[PDB]
RNA sequence: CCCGCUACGGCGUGAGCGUCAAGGUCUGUUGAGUGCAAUCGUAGGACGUCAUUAGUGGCGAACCCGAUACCGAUUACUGCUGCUGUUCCAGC
């Protein structure tokens, strides 16, 4: 199973309206990721810290998984998650994480400054730390801070699609990624493809070769897409739907229903999951002694 | 009492979208070499351009490329790096590297060119074992 | 004459000499309710093992004939046997009606609020619940349904019937996933199914009444992705 | 695991390209004729801008991406034409081969670059450089006294 | 202590007389070789196989180490050896080895032909094989012609001085050298500096890094540059003396 | 403080000793000892585990790098060993 958790949405501000051409382009790149092969896609959306957040409930997310991607799912056979990377630079007055977090699935951050990087790892409840690989690293990444943050949770995320943009950006990208791999102690590394087009898509064995040539091993790369990728999905998926990893509204069937795998069988209206009477306390004993299922 | 790695095969498949381009344009054999030299010239310099690679069993947007072992990733990182642009095709293309093996055993079709390539390799392996 | 002195640094010194050497009746039961509960759950397991032995001696696979066989031939052995047929209506109806009252589950379902309901379930006790092991690190623990007689800190106590087995079943919580169905009063139209994970909460119910649960590293949950 | 970087000492040597004028054959005399002087427009930023252009045109982009992560000139003075370049321990091969292919500066041509000392610390490289310059002063003093 | 064994003599034909500028330029570049710090110098001289060999004894070598370089041998503190690379393409006007091996010290060859490689591996008791790293590769390098020749004792030579000539020649240089590395089994690789000017001399630290990034390990490179170089020098010296 | 010159405290040498003072130094540094912080790269052979289409291929991990040394305690991971508890399956 493969997770690609940094596909961007062609919108930056809430005042802008997405045209149908970008939506069709996203449909074509999802068909591209379904063509060669992938398992999970978590599409990303960017907001700033100094913007004016809307005081709405059902209008915070211009993602619309149900009406357009619910139609794409039946011909596709995959799933989509909606996530936000927080572009936070200064500790301003804007703090509405209790609505933006519970509205979406995965909460990320994009720090630029010194103190913001500290208060993100310290107090801000997020899932992933993304750095601006297009621009310079802020000051320096320390070992014991990032190590304690990985031991607390949140892992670092490397965007190999940002090197496919320009020529000059590749040097700054590698200079950031080698420092991230060195200061992260190769524990918290989750990789993702930041492509805005299907014309910049790659296969698993090429991304593995890229991670080989950057400095991280190969078995640890595939383990990062098998173990480390799908666990940080489950972290935010249990934090925002259910309680703080405590009591889940997701049906535990044999091999078909899961909190990660069965998204459509859970009513995403509020919380609930309508399940038929599969548990009868009257005449059901041990599982190997049953005869009706 | 060991075996020195001679080279390694690489299985490429040019995934090309925008079906009008896939139906109109037809990549010939010189375009493969020109685009691979352009890809090794964009991301790498002279030493990355001097990577020894030859062409074997070229099909319609399908390629088998032999590259020496000590620069294996030096090849396979660059192929997933460069994007085709402004070379006789209006749209850019994507590359899918399907599988890698260092022991000659791949099964594509029941075609007879692979048996001929295996015989050419065994004629050199017998000279490696004897001489 | 090497630096690695095996006999000298451990066996022959005075600091590591302590290390192993290199050449080498009714009132007394219910004084504490916990110890009496332990004696009861041990006595139920011993009586279940004796019931299995007397059931192989009976050579009858039917449990309804087996209970009457024990009533006819073994009176003192029958006294500590559980009664699951009695255990189902005395627990399930009260549990379902308590959850229908507490979580405000009524005929009007379109005014539901999930976050406060999960907070109430975090505040409600699980003593007397029907619960099912749906996923586990052990492949043999899954498929077990049972009703709670007592909540522990890190284990879980249920009871399940087999063909003739009536053993009190203890199941670990560290690395297991549990699920329970909440029925609605309509017949075969709609019902709810919730899930918990016993590795996430590792405290007493006394502490669970007061504790506000926070985030964890959650690295050991790979089994939930694995199976 | 800390920042295990390797420092590389390099020296700019000017060969005596003059076929019309005769030459003298001695040790310290040819040390004088090769260790003459650096030209006027030589600084830290000029050598860095030249070595980044040589890194681009010789090794490429992704090689320059791997090289330019911790590629800095820590110490350089034009009076002696000796410089110390910080680099990674893995790409030290790439940095030395980039120092080898330095053909000419954009202002002055006709020069070679000698990579002399490589170590993981700068304090031992300075100690070796003082001893090497002391040996140079010994050879100069021996040929000057006789 | 190092051995540099590929310095060319500025003359190609015996009819051409060496000017006074070329001798001074050779003194310049050999002093530049000693400046970075070398021990052995074996200067090379190029002849064609189509050229008619002279029937002389004391005139086969127009190098004259004794009268010109005999002063620099005493002043600088080095020594010189004379060697010949043979530009052989076709088996015609040749097959003479008993006279050219006695005058000179090391006998090398330059095959550019497919049959030339076979006749070099078959009936030439030479020391080193040189390929044209400047121009293109002749046909294809194989393990069959290389492994039968390296196991006999003949080494394969890489010219790192030909790389600092042009910009376009560097690509063909890397393509030739990496082919020699993959065909040579990383054993019989002797490297030399083909510099004609003093602006093209490099030191051991850069050249070792060059041959390391081109594909030879650091053990085999330094082990070669010491042992195999000083072994083929004694091979030529014992072919002279014994 | 002893020797020679001179004689009011003086002067010259001992590669001499005792006291006192000085952010002048401490690789006076350790069967590793750095301090803008070294602890390497490759090849061959021996052993162990796992997967094979002909017999070979991959792996020897993870945590973490001191800064004078030592001991005890705690915490991060792999493998072995003993005990305890749980679940599943039978011999009669």
Curated annotation (Swiss-Prot), chain A:
The lineage of its organism: Eukaryota, Fungi, Dikarya, Ascomycota, Saccharomycotina. GO terms for cellular component: cytosol; nucleolar ribonuclease P complex; nucleus; ribonuclease MRP complex. Component of ribonuclease P, a protein complex that generates mature tRNA molecules by cleaving their 5'-ends. Also a component of RNase MRP, which cleaves pre-rRNA sequences. Present with 6300 molecules/cell in log phase SD medium. It is found in: Nucleus. Belongs to the eukaryotic/archaeal RNase P protein component 3 family. It catalyses: Endonucleolytic cleavage of RNA, removing 5'-extranucleotides from tRNA precursor. Component of nuclear RNase P and RNase MRP complexes. RNase P consists of an RNA moiety and at least 9 protein subunits including POP1, POP3, POP4, POP5, POP6, POP7, POP8, RPP1 and RPR2. RNase MRP complex consists of an RNA moiety and at least 10 protein subunits including POP1, POP3, POP4, POP5, POP6, POP7, POP8, RMP1, RPP1 and SNM1, many of which are shared with the RNase P complex. This is Ribonuclease P/MRP protein subunit RPP1. It comes from the Eukaryota. The gene is RPP1. Its EC number is 3.1.26.5. GO terms for biological process: intronic box C/D snoRNA processing; maturation of 5.8S rRNA; nuclear-transcribed mRNA catabolic process, RNase MRP-dependent; rRNA processing; tRNA 5'-leader removal; tRNA processing. It is an enzyme of class 3 (hydrolase). Pfam families: RNase_P_p30. One of its GO terms (molecular function) is RNA binding. Keywords: Hydrolase, Nucleus, rRNA processing, tRNA processing.
From Swiss-Prot, chain B:
Its main location: nucleus. One of its GO terms (cellular component) is ribonuclease MRP complex. The keyword Hydrolase applies. This is Ribonucleases P/MRP protein subunit POP8. One of its GO terms (biological process) is intronic box C/D snoRNA processing. It comes from the Eukaryota. It is found in: Nucleus. Keywords: Hydrolase, Nucleus, rRNA processing, tRNA processing. It catalyses: Endonucleolytic cleavage of RNA, removing 5'-extranucleotides from tRNA precursor. GO terms for molecular function: ribonuclease P activity. Component of ribonuclease P, a protein complex that generates mature tRNA molecules by cleaving their 5'-ends. Also a component of RNase MRP, which cleaves pre-rRNA sequences. Its EC number is 3.1.26.5. InterPro entries: Pop8, Pop8-like_dom. Present with 4870 molecules/cell in log phase SD medium. PANTHER family: RIBONUCLEASES P/MRP PROTEIN SUBUNIT POP8, RIBONUCLEASES P_MRP PROTEIN SUBUNIT POP8. Component of nuclear RNase P and RNase MRP complexes. RNase P consists of an RNA moiety and at least 9 protein subunits including POP1, POP3, POP4, POP5, POP6, POP7, POP8, RPP1 and RPR2. RNase MRP complex consists of an RNA moiety and at least 10 protein subunits including POP1, POP3, POP4, POP5, POP6, POP7, POP8, RMP1, RPP1 and SNM1, many of which are shared with the RNase P complex. It comes from Saccharomyces cerevisiae (strain ATCC 204508 / S288c) (Baker's yeast).
From Swiss-Prot, chain C:
InterPro entries: RNase_P/MRP_Rpp29-subunit, RNase_P/MRP_Rpp29_sf, Rof/RNase_P-like, Rpp29/RNP1. GO terms for cellular component: nucleolar ribonuclease P complex; ribonuclease MRP complex; ribonuclease P complex. Pfam families: RNase_P-MRP_p29. Its main location: nucleus. It comes from the Eukaryota. One of its GO terms (biological process) is rRNA processing. The keyword Chaperone does not apply. GO terms for molecular function: ribonuclease P RNA binding; RNA binding; rRNA primary transcript binding. It is found in: Nucleus. SUPFAM superfamilies: Rof/RNase P subunit-like. Keywords: Nucleus, Phosphoprotein, rRNA processing, tRNA processing. Belongs to the eukaryotic/archaeal RNase P protein component 1 family. Component of nuclear RNase P and RNase MRP complexes. RNase P consists of an RNA moiety and at least 9 protein subunits including POP1, POP3, POP4, POP5, POP6, POP7, POP8, RPP1 and RPR2. RNase MRP complex consists of an RNA moiety and at least 10 protein subunits including POP1, POP3, POP4, POP5, POP6, POP7, POP8, RMP1, RPP1 and SNM1, many of which are shared with the RNase P complex. Required for 5.8S rRNA and tRNA processing; associated with RNase MRP and RNase P. This is RNases MRP/P 32.9 kDa subunit.
Curated annotation (Swiss-Prot), chain D:
This is Ribonuclease P/MRP protein subunit POP5. Present with 2230 molecules/cell in log phase SD medium. GO terms for cellular component: cytoplasm; nucleolar ribonuclease P complex; ribonuclease MRP complex. Component of nuclear RNase P and RNase MRP complexes. RNase P consists of an RNA moiety and at least 9 protein subunits including POP1, POP3, POP4, POP5, POP6, POP7, POP8, RPP1 and RPR2. RNase MRP complex consists of an RNA moiety and at least 10 protein subunits including POP1, POP3, POP4, POP5, POP6, POP7, POP8, RMP1, RPP1 and SNM1, many of which are shared with the RNase P complex. Component of ribonuclease P, a protein complex that generates mature tRNA molecules by cleaving their 5'-ends. Also a component of RNase MRP, which cleaves pre-rRNA sequences. The lineage of its organism: Eukaryota, Fungi, Dikarya, Ascomycota, Saccharomycotina. One of its GO terms (molecular function) is ribonuclease P activity. It catalyses: Endonucleolytic cleavage of RNA, removing 5'-extranucleotides from tRNA precursor. The keyword Repeat does not apply.
